[PDB]
């Protein structure tokens with residue numbers, strides 16, 4: 001419990017909504033996407049403006065509260081809710097200003113991808129982000145951020161030009177290439193370690209309809225499909241994006257009844273460019289195996305962003321183990337095929353992603369984001385509903401990771417699970433981590449922002 | 459020019475951004491979706507909160523300025539921008555709160571539909587709205603609001619539980635079925651006539667994946683297709699929505715190149731319900747003619763919302779003529795088909811829509827929205843780029859409306875064009891218009907809010 005004078009000064013200065021443990025909406029407001037994370041904050045501060053974040057940050061500093069920051073709540077490590085502290089909740093700060101003439105967007109730190117993509121696509125514009133519309137822009141960008149447009153236009157952070165950020169001392173800074181560039185380097189891949197970003201400014205690109213295809217392959221054909229994918233993507237043009245999701249076949253009308261609920265490869269591909277060139281490019285990779293339940297469409301980019309994933313049935317409980325690879329050996333391929341065959345939940349996916357492209361043409365040290373040179377990402381994304389089944393699904397993710405871990409290097413900070421705080425050094429590597437620690441010593445010396453993949457100062 | 463003490467009082471109490479005619483942003487901020495409307499306001503006030511709106515409304519009243527209110531800026535009459543007045547611009551108020559347990563959404567009056575649907579679909583919830591993601595929620599709901607979910611769940615206003623509204627005198631009111639119910643009746647169909655809605659509260663429904671189909675028919679088979687559409691829809695279950703859009707075929711790879719740029723019927727259909735039943739219901743309506751470029755998919759609802767329209771081009775200039783039909787005779791069908799063959803712009807649509815269903819089962823006098831018992835809507839929506847071609851496109855819409863005038867009645871206020879201020883009485887009918895005038899006499903007696911399909915007080 002808190003100082004009255006400190007709390008009263010906070011309440012007068014705070015324009016947003018405060019949510020106490022006794023309030024009706026406390027239980028829904030403290031839930032985040034990873035439902036296995038059950039925590040009880042002392043206070044949830046729903047900010048509506050940059051002055052609100054300044055007041056909440058100062059309040060937390062003086063009062064000694066543990067600080068959780070929440071954008072869209074999608075932390076796979078559960079960092080956006082704390083026990084006994086304050087949640088600086090940005091979900092009500094989701095305004096977007098788009099300039100069609102300048103090809104610029106200014107978005108508040110609480111935006112969801114779908115709101116952002118709606119605003120830019122009102123002008124046939126877009127900039128890279130993740131593939132699920134209700135992910136938060138805040139956490140996604142600060143870790144790097146990749147999706148459909150990334151092989152063509154880079155990570156989200158490769159299109160970011162400045163941020164407004166509230167630092168631990170309550171001061172509001174602007175960071176960019178011309179102002180506080182040490183800070184600007186660190187927020188592009190260093191997470192929420194350095195303060196609360198209340199505004200992101202992006203460069204946008206013209207993105208009209210995209211030819212898109214999704215289809216399913218029998219695991220019978222697993223070896224030939226994954227090897228075709230790995231070989232083709234090594235030399236594919238930047239305009240082609242092709243991703244593999246190993247999962248149980250959803251009970252959908254386009255799929256034969258005898259495939260429902262059985263392990264399959266779900267392959268999703270799109271061409272960022274001319275749709276007629278796209279139709280020719282996709283037809284030539286869709287028949288690596290016999291395609292079942294093939295869906296082909298020419299979609300507005302916003303509808304591509306909203307498509308993922310097939311089945312659309314939001315899971316309650318999640319556990320992820322992820323890593324990068326430099327190559328995908330035959331030994332690795334048979335390992336992922338064997339564990340795909342043991343998937344138990346219809347909501348679990350073993351994701352095989354290929355980045356590279358424009359992501360890999362940015363020099364390594366240009367941003368805080370690591371592993372630009374590793375084009376492969378594997379993600380064992382277990383998801384389920386029943387809390388008494390946690391061990392079964394968590395064990396699938398862990399045993400698959402361990403069987404693969406020798407082939408893996410690094411790790412995407414935004415795919416880390418609640419027990420992977422120790423993976424931070426191996427994620428960034430030694431030189432980036434050390435540079436990150438020096439920025440942290442300058443801007444967050446007391447480590448006030450430690451619910452993240454944390455970088456201790458000095 | 460403005461009295462400097464009133465202006466300083468406004469600027470102190472206003473926590474948003476003011477955009478003056480001398481500012482660099484002025485020309486982009488005063489543009490609205492309908493590019494034929496070129497107006498220069500004295501001031502654009504970008505509000506960030508309900509108190510911002512209160513200050514702007516009170517500043518406009520005291521200064522005698524003409525008030526334009528802007529949500530998403532999609533007014534087909536150009537009402538969201540004014541010459542010499544103030545634009546009360548809500549585009550930055552786009553925050554949404556969703557309660558999964560209570561199945562409820564609270565959205566600010568500046569929201570765009572895509573932002574709304576992203577927030578609700580994070581919980582697999584939805585409530586009816588329009589078919590294009592970057593339409594503003596504010597104007598659409600105040601005029602009624604229909605789209606994919608409407609035959610099943612009604613108009614947007616049929617799911618509205620309450621509003622927070624800033625009236626002409628500067629007061630903030632709540633309106634619901636138990637609090638100011640005369641105002642709550644009028645805002646549900648009466649447009650912006652009664653004040654600035656800063657928050658809408660909605661009931662939500664669970665909407666998982668939906669089977670969807672879009673395809674194209676030659677006008678050669680046009681009489682067979684339209685007759686099958688009007689016959690089938692008279693007795694179709696609520697779960698089926700089927701819409702026809704007569705247009706030039708977009709140059710998409712799913713269509714044979716010899717159809718590109720020639721008039722066709724674009725037919726879009728969905729089943730709000732089980733996708734397997736949806737696949738059977740859709741297949742039963744897809745073959746009244748030979749379907750070309752057939753796209754079939756099982757989509758998350760948010761992706762269905764983001765799909766329209768094929769080609770994903772934003773036109774700069776628009777002109778619309780719309781009315782309702784109680785029946786669609788064979789003679790009207792021939793008139794529609796002949797007029798469609800004359801379409802010149804690739805962005806023009808002659809839309810044939812069928813509402814009915816849940817829309818028609820709400821008692822006529824339960825809301826201010828008129829014509830619930832007319833199932834058909836036709837919208838001659840001309841759209842183009844070149845400002846030297848205005849006359850030809852505008853004349854296409856007017857001549858088609860005049861050729862159909864024997865079959866048309868009423869009119870949707872949200873489809874009115876800039877020259878249709880006179881149609882307000884015919885749209886609502888005498889009895890509804892008179893009662894609307896009595897509510898207006900009470901809440902906006904000076905007709906402060908007149909940039910809308912206007913209802914004079916008394």
Ligand SMILES: Cc1cc2nc3c(=O)[nH]c(=O)nc-3n(C[C@H](O)[C@H](O)[C@H](O)COP(=O)(O)OP(=O)(O)OC[C@H]3O[C@@H](n4cnc5c(N)ncnc54)[C@H](O)[C@@H]3O)c2cc1C
Pocket residue numbers: 032033068069070071072073074075076079080090109110129130131132135136137138139140141142143144145146147191192193195196197198414415451452453
């Ligand atoms: C279903 C799903 C799909 C995903 N798809 C992708 C994908 O396609 N591509 C991809 O790259 N990632 C993807 N992700 C991962 C995503 O990038 C991370 O989970 C990210 O951290 C989520 O951001 P958030 O704001 O929603 O999360 P939150 O839980 O709100 O926050 C995440 C972290 O960032 C911090 N943070 C958030 N907002 C701010 C802010 N404004 N200022 C400072 N710190 C902040 C929080 O303190 C926390 O440490 C996906 C995740 C999920 C669950």
Ligand SMILES: Cc1cc2nc3c(=O)[nH]c(=O)nc-3n(C[C@H](O)[C@H](O)[C@H](O)COP(=O)(O)OP(=O)(O)OC[C@H]3O[C@@H](n4cnc5c(N)ncnc54)[C@H](O)[C@@H]3O)c2cc1C
Pocket residue numbers: 490491526527528529530531532533534537538548567568587588589590593594595596597598599600601602603604605649650651653654655656872873909910911
């Ligand atoms: C491409 C396109 C697709 C469309 N599709 C559909 C569809 O599927 N279904 C449908 O029913 N309609 C549809 N519409 C029409 C739409 O309902 C109207 O154009 C609506 O008025 C647009 O709302 P807005 O806030 O974007 O418009 P604006 O131009 O910002 O405002 C329109 C009117 O509403 C008033 N207003 C707006 N917000 C508020 C508020 N918060 N409080 C008070 N008054 C307010 C304004 O003063 C003005 O009179 C479509 C329009 C377009 C251009």
